[PDB]
Amino acid sequence: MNQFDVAVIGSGPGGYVAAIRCAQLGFKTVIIEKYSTLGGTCLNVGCIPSKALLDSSEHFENAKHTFATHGILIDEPKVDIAQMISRKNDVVDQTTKGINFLMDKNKITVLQGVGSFESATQIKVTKADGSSEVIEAKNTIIATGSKPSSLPFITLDKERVITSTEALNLKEVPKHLIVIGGGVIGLELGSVYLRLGSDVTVVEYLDKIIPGMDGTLSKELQKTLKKQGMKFMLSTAVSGVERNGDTVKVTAKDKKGEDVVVEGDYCLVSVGRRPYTDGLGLEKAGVELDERGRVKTNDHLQTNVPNIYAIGDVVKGAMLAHKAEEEGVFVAETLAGEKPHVNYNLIPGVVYTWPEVAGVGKTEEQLKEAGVAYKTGSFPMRALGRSRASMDTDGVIKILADEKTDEILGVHMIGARAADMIAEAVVAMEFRASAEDIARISHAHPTYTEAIKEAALDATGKRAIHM
Amino acid sequence: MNQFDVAVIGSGPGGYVAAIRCAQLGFKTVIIEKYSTLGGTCLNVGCIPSKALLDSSEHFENAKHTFATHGILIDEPKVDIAQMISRKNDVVDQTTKGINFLMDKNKITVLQGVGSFESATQIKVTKADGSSEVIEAKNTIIATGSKPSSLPFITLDKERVITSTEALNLKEVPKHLIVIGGGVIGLELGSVYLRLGSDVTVVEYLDKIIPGMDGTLSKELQKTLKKQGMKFMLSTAVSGVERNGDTVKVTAKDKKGEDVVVEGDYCLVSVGRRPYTDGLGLEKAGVELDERGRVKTNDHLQTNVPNIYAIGDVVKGAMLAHKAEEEGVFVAETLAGEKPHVNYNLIPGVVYTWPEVAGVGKTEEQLKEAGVAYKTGSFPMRALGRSRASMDTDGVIKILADEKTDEILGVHMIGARAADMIAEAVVAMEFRASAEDIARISHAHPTYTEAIKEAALDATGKRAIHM
Ligand SMILES: Cc1cc2nc3c(=O)[nH]c(=O)nc-3n(C[C@H](O)[C@H](O)[C@H](O)COP(=O)(O)OP(=O)(O)OC[C@H]3O[C@@H](n4cnc5c(N)ncnc54)[C@H](O)[C@@H]3O)c2cc1C
Ligand SMILES: Cc1cc2nc3c(=O)[nH]c(=O)nc-3n(C[C@H](O)[C@H](O)[C@H](O)COP(=O)(O)OP(=O)(O)OC[C@H]3O[C@@H](n4cnc5c(N)ncnc54)[C@H](O)[C@@H]3O)c2cc1C
Ligand SMILES: [Cl-]
Numbered sequence: 011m012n013q014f015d016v017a018v019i020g021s022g023p024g025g026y027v028a029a030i031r032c033a034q035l036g037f038k039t040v041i042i043e044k045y046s047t048l049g050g051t052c053l054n055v056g057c058i059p060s061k062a063l064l065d066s067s068e069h070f071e072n073a074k075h076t077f078a079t080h081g082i083l084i085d086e087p088k089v090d091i092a093q094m095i096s097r098k099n100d101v102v103d104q105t106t107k108g109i110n111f112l113m114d115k116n117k118i119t120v121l122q123g124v125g126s127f128e129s130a131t132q133i134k135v136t137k138a139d140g141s142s143e144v145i146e147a148k149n150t151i152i153a154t155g156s157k158p159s160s161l162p163f164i165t166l167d168k169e170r171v172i173t174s175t176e177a178l179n180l181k182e183v184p185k186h187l188i189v190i191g192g193g194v195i196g197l198e199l200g201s202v203y204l205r206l207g208s209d210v211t212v213v214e215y216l217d218k219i220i221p222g223m224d225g226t227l228s229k230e231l232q233k234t235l236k237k238q239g240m241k242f243m244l245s246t247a248v249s250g251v252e253r254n255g256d257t258v259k260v261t262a263k264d265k266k267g268e269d270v271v272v273e274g275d276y277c278l279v280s281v282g283r284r285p286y287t288d289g290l291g292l293e294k295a296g297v298e299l300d301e302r303g304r305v306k307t308n309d310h311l312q313t314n315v316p317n318i319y320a321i322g323d324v325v326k327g328a329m330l331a332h333k334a335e336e337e338g339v340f341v342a343e344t345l346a347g348e349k350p351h352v353n354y355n356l357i358p359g360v361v362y363t364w365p366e367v368a369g370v371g372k373t374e375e376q377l378k379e380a381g382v383a384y385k386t387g388s389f390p391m392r393a394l395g396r397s398r399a400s401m402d403t404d405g406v407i408k409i410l411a412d413e414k415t416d417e418i419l420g421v422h423m424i425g426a427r428a429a430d431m432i433a434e435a436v437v438a439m440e441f442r443a444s445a446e447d448i449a450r451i452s453h454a455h456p457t458y459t460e461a462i463k464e465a466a467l468d469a470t471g472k473r474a475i476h477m
Numbered sequence: 478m479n480q481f482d483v484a485v486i487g488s489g490p491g492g493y494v495a496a497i498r499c500a501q502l503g504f505k506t507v508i509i510e511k512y513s514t515l516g517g518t519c520l521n522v523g524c525i526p527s528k529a530l531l532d533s534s535e536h537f538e539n540a541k542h543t544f545a546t547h548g549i550l551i552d553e554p555k556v557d558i559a560q561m562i563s564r565k566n567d568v569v570d571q572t573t574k575g576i577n578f579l580m581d582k583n584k585i586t587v588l589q590g591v592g593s594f595e596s597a598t599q600i601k602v603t604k605a606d607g608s609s610e611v612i613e614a615k616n617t618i619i620a621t622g623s624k625p626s627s628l629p630f631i632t633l634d635k636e637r638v639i640t641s642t643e644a645l646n647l648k649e650v651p652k653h654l655i656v657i658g659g660g661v662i663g664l665e666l667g668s669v670y671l672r673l674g675s676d677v678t679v680v681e682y683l684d685k686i687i688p689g690m691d692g693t694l695s696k697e698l699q700k701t702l703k704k705q706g707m708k709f710m711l712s713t714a715v716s717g718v719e720r721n722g723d724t725v726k727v728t729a730k731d732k733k734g735e736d737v738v739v740e741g742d743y744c745l746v747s748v749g750r751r752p753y754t755d756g757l758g759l760e761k762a763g764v765e766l767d768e769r770g771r772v773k774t775n776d777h778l779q780t781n782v783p784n785i786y787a788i789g790d791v792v793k794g795a796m797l798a799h800k801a802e803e804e805g806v807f808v809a810e811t812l813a814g815e816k817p818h819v820n821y822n823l824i825p826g827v828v829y830t831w832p833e834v835a836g837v838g839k840t841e842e843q844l845k846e847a848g849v850a851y852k853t854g855s856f857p858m859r860a861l862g863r864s865r866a867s868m869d870t871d872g873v874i875k876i877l878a879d880e881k882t883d884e885i886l887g888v889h890m891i892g893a894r895a896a897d898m899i900a901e902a903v904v905a906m907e908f909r910a911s912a913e914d915i916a917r918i919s920h921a922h923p924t925y926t927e928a929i930k931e932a933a934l935d936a937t938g939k940r941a942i943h944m
C-alpha cells in the first residue's frame with residue numbers, strides 16, 4: 011500500500027491548486043482524476059472552451075458589422091466552424107499539458123481513475139480496465155466538483171437536445187438555438203452562436219436574467235443582449251422538450267398561464283450546476299451531505315470526519331473556479347497549522363459576454379433587505395473617450411457606498427473589459443476603501459477604468475466631472 | 478469689464494477639468510481656448526485620435542493574420558485609409574460636443590481666442606480677426622499644454638516630414654515609415670501603420686525604447702514589436718533628415734561610428750513634447766519659467782506670483798493626460814481652502830500598443846540607483862488560460878516588493894488589457910499593500926489579472942501556483 015500525507019480527489023481548479031499548495035507546504039501529495047486528462051470542468055468542458063469560442067465569435071461579430079466603419083474592406087465573412095472548434099480543442103490540450111507540467115514540477119503523484127473511500131484513511135483507485143489499487147492518506151481533500159443540472163422530463167441526446175458540453179462541440183452553426191434555463195452558461199454560449207448567425211431564444215422560468223447579481227446589471231445585460239439580437243421569454247415554465255428529427259419543440263406556459271411553443275434545430279439546457287459525489291464512497295468514510303447534495307463543511311472547510319476536507323463546487327458558496335482555487339489554498343494552509351481566511355463577500359463573479367459583466371460585494375437588493383442606509387453612484391460607459399474610440403460603448407459602472415461612512419459596499423459593472431476592471435474594486439473593498447478614496451486616485455486616461463473613478467465621484471458627493 | 482473668480486487658459490484635460498471642479502466649488506469660472514474646438518492636445522491631436530487608429534489597425538491585423546486560425550473565412554483584407562481617418566475625426570467630433578455639454582452644464586463661460594496676460598488680474602483675449610476683450614480674474618490657472626519637440630536640423634513640412642499631428646491624418650498608407658525617437662508616441666503611431674502594411678523603422682538615440690519606463694517593459698515591448706514586424710535602429714544618433722522629393726533620407730551614425738542611411742517615403746519626428754507658452758504674455762504678469770521652458774511651480778502648483786497657478790504639460794512632471802486632470806482638481810480644491818495631495822509616484826503610465834504596456838511606482842532601475850533591497854515577482858502572460866484562449870500570449874507582469882516589509886514598490890505590465898489592469902496596482906500601492914496581500918485576494922478566473930496574483934505570489938515568497 012502506498013502512503014501519502016494528503017490525497018486530493020478531483021483535478022479541477024480547486025483540486026490541482028490545492029495539491030500544489032500542499033506540495034509547497036511539504037506534504038507528500040497525491041491527486042486522483044477519473045478523466046483522461048487533468049483540469050476538471052473548467053478546462054475540459056467549462057471556462058477555457060467558452061472563452062475561446064467567445065473570443066473567436068466576437069472577432070466574427072466585428073468583421074460582419076463594424077469593419078466597414080473601421081475602414082476595413084472585406085467581403086461577407088463566413089464561419090469555418092470546424093476550425094473554430096478545432097482551435098478551441100488545441101487551447102484545451104495546451105492548458106492540460108501545462109497542468110501536467112505543474113504536477114511534475116511540484117512532485118505530485120498523479121493517478122488516473124475513480125477515487126472511492128474505503129475508510130477515513132483508505133481510498134480505492136479504479137482504473138478504466140476495472141482493476142483497483144488502494145492507497146493510504148492521512149488527510150483527504152474532496153474536490154469532485156459539479157455536473158450539469160437538467161430537468162427530469164428532458165431527454166438529452168448529445169445531438170440536438172444538449173448541455174454545454176456538447177454545445178461546445180457543434181458541427182454546424184444552429185439556425186435557431188433555444189436556451190432552456192437561466193444559467194450564465196446559456197447566455198455565454200448563446201452569445202457565441204448569436205454572433206455566428208444563429209437565432210437565439212432564451213426560455214426561462216426566472217423573472218430576470220442573472221438574478222443573483224445586482225438588479226441594474228440584470229437590467230443592462232438584457233438590454234444589450236436584446237440589442238444584439240437575442241430574444242427572451244422570461245417567467246415561462248417549460249413542460250416539454252420534444253425532438254422531431256431536425257427540430258426541437260419546447261412547450262411551456264407564461265406568467266398569464268397561456269400556452270407557449272418554441273421550435274428550433276438545437277436546444278441547450280442551462281438550468282444550473284449540481285454538486286457531484288457519485289461513486290465517491292462517502293458512506294464508507296462517514297462524510298455527511300446536506301439536503302442539497304453538498305458536502306457539509308464548517309469554518310475550516312472541514313467535514314464531520316476531521317481529517318477529510320472539501321472545497322469547490324461540491325460545497326456551499328458561489329460555484330466559481332477562483333472560489334475553488336482559494337478554498338484549496340485555504341485547506342492546504344490549514345493542514346499546515348496556519349490560520350488563513352476567506353472573505354466570501356469579496357469573491358467576484360464574472361459573465362463573459364460582450365460587454366463583460368462583473369460584480370463584487372453586496373447587491374442593492376441585499377442592502378435593501380438588510381435595511382442598510384446606502385448611496386448610489388453611477389457613470390455610463392458611452393461617456394468615456396476610450397469607449398467612443400473603440401465603439402465598445404454599452405454599459406454602466408455602479409458603486410454602492412455606506413451613507414454615513416462612505417465605505418464602498420458593492421461595485422457592479424457592465425462594459426468593455428469588466429472581467430478585468432473588477433479587480434480594482436476587489437482590491438479597493440479589501441482595504442475597506444471609501445468612494446472618496448477611489449475618486450481621488452489617479453486613473454489612466456483614456457481607459458475604461460475611468461468610469462470607476464467617475465462613479466466613485468458620483469457616489470461620494472454627486473460631483474463627477476465627465477457626466 | 479466682466480469679473481470672474483478663476484480664469485483657465487487652455488481647454489486640455491487639465492484645463493477643462495479644473496474649470497468643472499472650480500464650478501463645482503462655487504467659483505465664477507471662465508475658460509479660454511485659441512483652437513476652434515475644445516479638448517486640447519489629448520482630444521484633437523493626441524490620446525483620442527491615436528487610440529481610435531490603434532483600434533482600427535489592430536482589427537485589420539487580426540483579419541490579416543489570425544482570422545484563419547480563428548475559423549473566420551475572408552479574402553485578403555484591404556485598407557480604406559480615408560474611411561479610417563474619417564471615423565477617427567467623427568470620434569473627436571463626438572468628444573468635443575461632450576466637452577461643450579460639460580461646460581454649459583457647469584455654467585462655465587467659454588471664450589475663443591488667444592489668452593494673454595495684461596497683469597496678474599487682467600487677461601486679454603485676442604480673436605482671429607484682431608478684436609479683443611479684457612477680463613478680470615482673482616485667480617488664473619495656466620494650462621497651455623505642449624507642442625511637439627524637434628531637432629534643430631529638422632525642417633518639418635506637414636507633408637512627409639511630419640509630427641504626430643499630421644501622421645494622424647495621412648492620406649495613404651506609407652510604403653516605409655521612419656520613426657525618429659522610441660517614445661510612447663512613436664511606437665504607437667508606428668504600430669498603427671505597421672499593421673496597415675507599412676514597413677516601420679524606429680531610430681532611437683538611447684539603447685532602449687520607452688526608456689522612461691522599467692527596463693523589463695522596454696525589453697519585452699521591443700521583443701514583441703520586432704515579432705510584429707517593426708525594425709529598430711537603437712544607439713543611433715541622427716545628424717540629418719533631408720527631404721529629396723517623394724523620399725526622406727535620414728543620416729546618422731551607429732554605436733561603432735559607422736555611417737548609416739535610412740530611406741522612406743514618410744518620416745515621423747517623435748523626440749518628445751515641449752511645454753507651450755507662446756503668446757501667453759507671462760512677462761507682462763511676471764511669471765518665471767525654468768531652464769526647460771516650463772512654468773515654475775511649488776508644492777501647491779503655485780507660481781512666484783501667488784494668485785496664478787499652472788497645471789498639465791506646461792509644468793514639471795510626467796506629460797500625461799490624467800496627470801493634468803488631477804493637477805487641475807488639485808489647484809481647484811486648493812483655491813477652495815482645502816488641503817488635497819497628489820502622489821506623483823502613483824500616477825500610472827500606459828503605452829497603447831498590443832499587447833498594452835503599463836507601469837506604476839518605482840522602476841527596478843530606480844530601486845537599484847537608490848540601493849533599496851527588493852524582491853522581484855514575475856509571471857508570464859502565455860501561461861494564463863485566458864491568454865491561450867484569445868491568442869494574446871505575449872508579455873509579463875512584474876512586481877517589485879520591499880525585502881523587509883513585503884510592501885509593493887512598483888508594478889510593471891506588458892500584456893493584454895494592461896491599460897486597465899494597472900488600476901489594480903495603483904489602488905494596491907495607494908493602500909500600501911504588500912505582495913502577500915495581493916497574492917491572497919480573490920482574482921476572477923479566467924482573467925488576465927490572475928497574472929498579477931501569480932506575480933505577487935512569486936514576489937512574496939517564490940511560491941506562484943501556475944508557474
Ligand atoms: C461551460 C462552463 C463555463 C464555465 N465558465 C466559468 C467561468 O468563466 N468562470 C468560472 O469561475 N467558472 C466557470 N464555470 C464553472 C467552473 O467550471 C467551476 O466553478 C470550477 O471548475 C470549479 O471546479 P472544482 O475544482 O470544484 O471541480 P470541477 O472542475 O467541477 O472538476 C472536479 C473533478 O473531479 C473529478 N472527479 C469527480 N469524482 C471523482 C472521483 N470519484 N474520482 C476521481 N476524480 C473524480 C472530475 O472528473 C472532475 O475533473 C463554468 C462551467 C461550465 C460548465
Ligand atoms: C499623439 C499623442 C498621443 C498621446 N496619448 C496620450 C495617452 O494615451 N495618454 C496620456 O495620458 N497622454 C497622452 N498624450 C499626451 C496628452 O495629450 C497630454 O498629456 C494632455 O493633453 C495634457 O494636456 P493639458 O491640459 O496639460 O494641455 P493641452 O491638452 O496640451 O492643450 C491645452 C490647450 O491650450 C491651448 N492654448 C495654449 N496657449 C493658449 C493661450 N495663450 N490662449 C489660449 N489657448 C491656449 C492650446 O491650443 C491647447 O489646445 C498624447 C500626446 C500626443 C501628441
Ligand atoms: Cl472620461
Ligand SMILES: [Cl-]
Binds near residue numbers: 860861862927928943
Ligand atoms: Cl492562472
Ligand SMILES: [Zn+2]
Binds near residue numbers: 455456460802
Ligand atoms: Zn479622463
Ligand SMILES: [Zn+2]
Binds near residue numbers: 023335927
Ligand atoms: Zn485560476
